[PDB]
Design an enzyme around this catalytic site. Structure first.
Site, PDB file in Angstrom:
ATOM      1  N   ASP A 220       7.227  -1.936 -17.039  1.00 23.61           N
ATOM      2  CA  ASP A 220       5.772  -1.720 -17.049  1.00 23.61           C
ATOM      3  C   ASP A 220       5.453  -0.239 -17.268  1.00 23.61           C
ATOM      4  O   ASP A 220       4.698   0.386 -16.521  1.00 23.61           O
ATOM      5  CB  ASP A 220       5.173  -2.244 -15.732  1.00 23.61           C
ATOM      6  CG  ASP A 220       3.657  -2.341 -15.772  1.00 23.61           C
ATOM      7  OD1 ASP A 220       3.102  -2.600 -16.873  1.00 23.61           O
ATOM      8  OD2 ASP A 220       3.024  -2.148 -14.705  1.00 23.61           O
TER       9      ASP A 220
ATOM     10  N   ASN B  43       1.734   4.739 -14.566  1.00 20.64           N
ATOM     11  CA  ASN B  43       2.958   4.739 -13.759  1.00 20.64           C
ATOM     12  C   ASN B  43       3.807   5.966 -14.024  1.00 20.64           C
ATOM     13  O   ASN B  43       5.004   5.972 -13.755  1.00 20.64           O
ATOM     14  CB  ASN B  43       3.798   3.507 -14.073  1.00 20.64           C
ATOM     15  CG  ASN B  43       3.245   2.279 -13.492  1.00 20.64           C
ATOM     16  OD1 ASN B  43       2.514   2.330 -12.496  1.00 20.64           O
ATOM     17  ND2 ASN B  43       3.569   1.137 -14.107  1.00 20.64           N
TER      18      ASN B  43
ATOM     19  N   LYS C  92      23.460  14.212  21.786  1.00 23.54           N
ATOM     20  CA  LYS C  92      24.733  14.807  21.394  1.00 23.54           C
ATOM     21  C   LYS C  92      25.406  13.964  20.304  1.00 23.54           C
ATOM     22  O   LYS C  92      25.531  12.744  20.445  1.00 23.54           O
ATOM     23  CB  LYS C  92      25.662  14.921  22.619  1.00 23.54           C
ATOM     24  CG  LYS C  92      25.019  15.538  23.873  1.00 23.54           C
ATOM     25  CD  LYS C  92      26.004  15.651  25.027  1.00 23.54           C
ATOM     26  CE  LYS C  92      25.294  16.004  26.327  1.00 23.54           C
ATOM     27  NZ  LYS C  92      26.220  15.998  27.482  1.00 23.54           N
TER      28      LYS C  92
ATOM     29  N   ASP D 282      18.731  16.025 -20.996  1.00 27.93           N
ATOM     30  CA  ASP D 282      19.011  14.734 -20.323  1.00 27.93           C
ATOM     31  C   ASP D 282      18.849  14.752 -18.796  1.00 27.93           C
ATOM     32  O   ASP D 282      19.091  13.746 -18.161  1.00 27.93           O
ATOM     33  CB  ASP D 282      20.409  14.169 -20.701  1.00 27.93           C
ATOM     34  CG  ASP D 282      21.574  14.982 -20.136  1.00 27.93           C
ATOM     35  OD1 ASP D 282      21.370  16.013 -19.459  1.00 27.93           O
ATOM     36  OD2 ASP D 282      22.728  14.575 -20.374  1.00 27.93           O
TER      37      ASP D 282
ATOM     38  N   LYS E 232       3.767   2.834 -18.574  1.00 22.24           N
ATOM     39  CA  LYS E 232       2.448   3.169 -19.056  1.00 22.24           C
ATOM     40  C   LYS E 232       1.991   4.457 -18.354  1.00 22.24           C
ATOM     41  O   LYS E 232       2.599   4.895 -17.352  1.00 22.24           O
ATOM     42  CB  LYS E 232       1.467   2.001 -18.831  1.00 22.24           C
ATOM     43  CG  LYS E 232       1.364   1.515 -17.365  1.00 22.24           C
ATOM     44  CD  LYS E 232       0.394   0.347 -17.245  1.00 22.24           C
ATOM     45  CE  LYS E 232       0.336  -0.185 -15.833  1.00 22.24           C
ATOM     46  NZ  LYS E 232      -0.743  -1.205 -15.652  1.00 22.24           N
TER      47      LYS E 232
ATOM     48  N   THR F   4      -3.144  -2.748 -19.412  1.00 30.30           N
ATOM     49  CA  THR F   4      -1.690  -2.970 -19.462  1.00 30.30           C
ATOM     50  C   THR F   4      -1.255  -3.597 -20.806  1.00 30.30           C
ATOM     51  O   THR F   4      -0.161  -3.303 -21.308  1.00 30.30           O
ATOM     52  CB  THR F   4      -1.173  -3.831 -18.259  1.00 30.30           C
ATOM     53  OG1 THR F   4       0.271  -3.868 -18.272  1.00 30.30           O
ATOM     54  CG2 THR F   4      -1.739  -5.254 -18.302  1.00 30.30           C
TER      55      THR F   4
ATOM     56  N   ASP G 133      22.518  11.713  15.145  1.00 24.62           N
ATOM     57  CA  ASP G 133      22.444  11.144  16.490  1.00 24.62           C
ATOM     58  C   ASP G 133      21.751   9.778  16.422  1.00 24.62           C
ATOM     59  O   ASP G 133      20.539   9.666  16.626  1.00 24.62           O
ATOM     60  CB  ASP G 133      21.699  12.100  17.438  1.00 24.62           C
ATOM     61  CG  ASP G 133      21.765  11.666  18.900  1.00 24.62           C
ATOM     62  OD1 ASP G 133      20.950  12.164  19.707  1.00 24.62           O
ATOM     63  OD2 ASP G 133      22.632  10.837  19.254  1.00 24.62           O
TER      64      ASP G 133
ATOM     65  N   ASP H 222      19.737  23.051 -19.129  1.00 21.65           N
ATOM     66  CA  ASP H 222      19.876  21.664 -19.597  1.00 21.65           C
ATOM     67  C   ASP H 222      19.499  21.583 -21.087  1.00 21.65           C
ATOM     68  O   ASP H 222      18.469  21.042 -21.437  1.00 21.65           O
ATOM     69  CB  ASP H 222      18.972  20.742 -18.776  1.00 21.65           C
ATOM     70  CG  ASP H 222      19.065  19.318 -19.218  1.00 21.65           C
ATOM     71  OD1 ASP H 222      20.094  18.971 -19.853  1.00 21.65           O
ATOM     72  OD2 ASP H 222      18.120  18.549 -18.958  1.00 21.65           O
TER      73      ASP H 222
ATOM     74  N   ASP I 210       7.129   3.417  -9.806  1.00 22.13           N
ATOM     75  CA  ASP I 210       6.768   1.965  -9.789  1.00 22.13           C
ATOM     76  C   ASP I 210       7.643   1.108 -10.693  1.00 22.13           C
ATOM     77  O   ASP I 210       7.174   0.501 -11.668  1.00 22.13           O
ATOM     78  CB  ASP I 210       5.289   1.727 -10.116  1.00 22.13           C
ATOM     79  CG  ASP I 210       4.360   2.208  -9.013  1.00 22.13           C
ATOM     80  OD1 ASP I 210       4.875   2.708  -7.986  1.00 22.13           O
ATOM     81  OD2 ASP I 210       3.123   2.085  -9.177  1.00 22.13           O
TER      82      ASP I 210
ATOM     83  N   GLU J 198       0.817  -1.205   0.000  1.00 23.82           N
ATOM     84  CA  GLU J 198       0.000   0.000   0.000  1.00 23.82           C
ATOM     85  C   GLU J 198       0.849   1.253   0.000  1.00 23.82           C
ATOM     86  O   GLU J 198       1.971   1.238   0.497  1.00 23.82           O
ATOM     87  CB  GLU J 198      -0.942  -0.005   1.204  1.00 23.82           C
ATOM     88  CG  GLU J 198      -0.269   0.113   2.553  1.00 23.82           C
ATOM     89  CD  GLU J 198      -1.037  -0.588   3.676  1.00 23.82           C
ATOM     90  OE1 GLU J 198      -2.266  -0.820   3.509  1.00 23.82           O
ATOM     91  OE2 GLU J 198      -0.396  -0.907   4.718  1.00 23.82           O
ATOM     92  N   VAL J 199       0.304   2.329  -0.560  1.00 23.37           N
ATOM     93  CA  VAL J 199       0.938   3.648  -0.536  1.00 23.37           C
ATOM     94  C   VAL J 199       0.086   4.562   0.363  1.00 23.37           C
ATOM     95  O   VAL J 199      -1.145   4.648   0.209  1.00 23.37           O
ATOM     96  CB  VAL J 199       1.133   4.272  -1.952  1.00 23.37           C
ATOM     97  CG1 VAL J 199       1.722   5.651  -1.820  1.00 23.37           C
ATOM     98  CG2 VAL J 199       2.083   3.446  -2.822  1.00 23.37           C
TER      99      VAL J 199
ATOM    100  N   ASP K 198      30.347  18.792  -8.619  1.00 27.46           N
ATOM    101  CA  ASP K 198      30.112  17.413  -8.988  1.00 27.46           C
ATOM    102  C   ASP K 198      30.673  16.570  -7.881  1.00 27.46           C
ATOM    103  O   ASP K 198      31.743  15.989  -8.003  1.00 27.46           O
ATOM    104  CB  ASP K 198      30.787  17.086 -10.323  1.00 27.46           C
ATOM    105  CG  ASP K 198      30.538  15.652 -10.769  1.00 27.46           C
ATOM    106  OD1 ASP K 198      29.593  15.017 -10.239  1.00 27.46           O
ATOM    107  OD2 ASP K 198      31.284  15.172 -11.654  1.00 27.46           O
TER     108      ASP K 198
END
Ligand code: BK3
Ligand code: CA
Ligand code: CA
Ligand code: CA
Ligand code: CA
Length: 447
Positions: free
Chosen positions: A133, A138, A416, A328, A135, A169, A410, A324, A154, A24-25, A374
């Site tokens: 997958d 997702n 601390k 990319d 689509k 799907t 910590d 950019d 996903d 579940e989300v 970088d």
């Protein structure tokens, strides 16, 4: 530390968001910062297909993916029953629903969407990850704002976890998937099916049920026969044909998708006069970041990449996109050089005069900056490195953000920090940094 759990100590669950992708989300909230996240909860005993050490290793690779069109994951925590994978919350819903609302897209709008899909998949493939997958269900819209970034979700968990019949799907799968093969080229096919749908509003391999759809996919036979295809450019059709090539060895790569002339034609985004306040802000901050010690530089990158939200980085995100130029999702040396020259031109300032005022040319400036920016030495400035260096150093330091950054270090919870857990300033002389000295330490980096 006995009555405190990792997930439960840090986060409160607010509500359910979705069910299905290994678990579940939920939406959750950081108890200190009040910032909201999405968390995928995966049952250990039901779902594990690999040892925990394997799972943590592969999820760590997913956490390091840093691209503006790929789901951002912040952490994986655990208790006795579950893994909790905590990520950025996106609120704009599935690309699927945008297809339904709009029916189909102009070439311009389709290009902007599919470009981001290409950029994301390109980055995934360079990191040896195949989606499997892909689509519109997702791919999520980041927010409800116009032309916000899309986010591929996903993927990446399929070897680690075993899953528990979703409609449609079949439309997106490459013919070789029917032969039990998923490789990088199957993601390109799925993307081409998406693009076919964005431009025409109808799947290339279509039918009333799953049986008839799969028959057509198998043959690889599609056409641009629908009436709406007569007013779509030959360039768009050329890209689609290259993506829906039957043999995967002849099918184009994701990079080739991203680089296709039709994409480049609709990605002219570049610094303008309106961007100058934004560019000047960014340049001031990046210069300060260059001057700061590597301990400061490293500590700020941690803070920016974990604890910042969309509203706060939305400005820097647009600048990033305009710099950019190859689309990319990362900034290379030449893009930073060209961006600096363009900043000067737009401002009315001749770049040849930087050699006397500041003491070195734009190219020398960028070349000295690259090794400092970088930080993982990837060869590019990914989003979080840019954000770390370009964001207002003060905004990063709400008390709540410093508190959370303190709690992350910590690890024994004694109040601390000490060595290894991450130099020390130490006003009371105990060989440790309590929170108040940490807050000065971080407010000394800012100086
Ligand atoms: N980021 C998100 N934001 C909002 N809703 C989400 C998601 C996520 C993805 C997600 C969230 C948290 C951790 C993850 C770890 C690995 C892979 C994906 C993760 N799913 N859903 C729910 C909706 C339901 C409607 N169909 C589209 C998705
Ligand atoms: Ca780039
Ligand atoms: Ca990098
Ligand atoms: Ca401690
Ligand atoms: Ca102390």
């Amino acid at each position: 530390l006995y009555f405190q759990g990792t997930f439960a100590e840090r986060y409160n669950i607010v509500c359910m968001l979705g069910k299905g992708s290994f678990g579940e989300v939920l939406k959750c909230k950081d108890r200190i910062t009040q910032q909201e996240y999405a968390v995928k909860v995966i049952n250990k005993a039901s779902a594990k297909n690999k040892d925990t050490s394997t799972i943590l290793r592969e999820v760590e690779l997913l956490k390091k993916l840093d691209h503006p069109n790929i789901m951002k994951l912040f952490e994986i925590l655990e208790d006795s029953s579950s893994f909790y994978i905590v990520g950025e919350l996106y609120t704009g819903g599935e690309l699927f629903d945008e297809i339904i609302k709009r029916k189909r897209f102009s070439e311009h709008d389709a290009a902007r969407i599919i470009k981001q899909v290409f950029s994301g998949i390109t980055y995934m493939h360079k990191h040896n990850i195949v989606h499997r997958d892909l689509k519109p269900e997702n791919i999520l819209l980041e927010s409800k704002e116009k032309d916000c970034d899309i986010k591929i979700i996903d993927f990446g968990l399929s070897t680690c976890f075993q899953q528990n019949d979703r409609i449609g799907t079949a439309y997106y799968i490459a013919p070789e998937v029917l032969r039990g093969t998923y490789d990088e080229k199957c993601d390109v096919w799925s993307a081409g099916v998406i693009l076919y749908i964005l431009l025409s509003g109808t799947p290339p391999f279509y039918g009333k049920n799953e049986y008839d759809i799969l028959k057509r996919v198998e043959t690889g036979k599609y056409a641009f026969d629908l009436p709406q295809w007569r007013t779509i450019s030959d360039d768009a059709k050329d890209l689609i044909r290259k993506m829906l090539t039957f043999h995967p060895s002849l099918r184009i790569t994701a990079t080739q998708c991203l680089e296709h002339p039709w994409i480049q034609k609709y990605s002219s985004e570049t610094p303008t006069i309106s961007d100058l306040p934004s560019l000047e802000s960014a340049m001031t901050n990046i210069r300060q970041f260059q001057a700061e010690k590597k301990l400061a530089q490293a500590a700020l990158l941690y803070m920016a990449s974990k604890l910042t939200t969309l509203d706060e980085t939305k400005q820097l995100t647009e600048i990033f996109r305009k710099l950019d130029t190859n689309n990319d999702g990362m900034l290379d040396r030449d893009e930073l050089v060209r961006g600096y020259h363009e900043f000067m031109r737009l401002k009315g300032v001749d770049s040849n005069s930087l050699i006397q005022n500041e003491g070195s040319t734009i190219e020398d400036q960028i070349d000295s900056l690259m090794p400092l920016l970088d930080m993982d030495g990837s060869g590019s400035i990914e989003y979080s490195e840019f954000i770390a260096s370009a964001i207002d150093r003060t905004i990063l330091l709400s008390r709540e953000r410093m508190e959370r950054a303190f709690k992350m270090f910590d690890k024994d919870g004694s109040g601390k920090i000490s060595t290894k857990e991450l130099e020390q300033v130490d006003n009371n002389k105990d060989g440790e940094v309590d929170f108040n000295e940490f807050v000065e330490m971080l407010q000394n980096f800012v100086r």
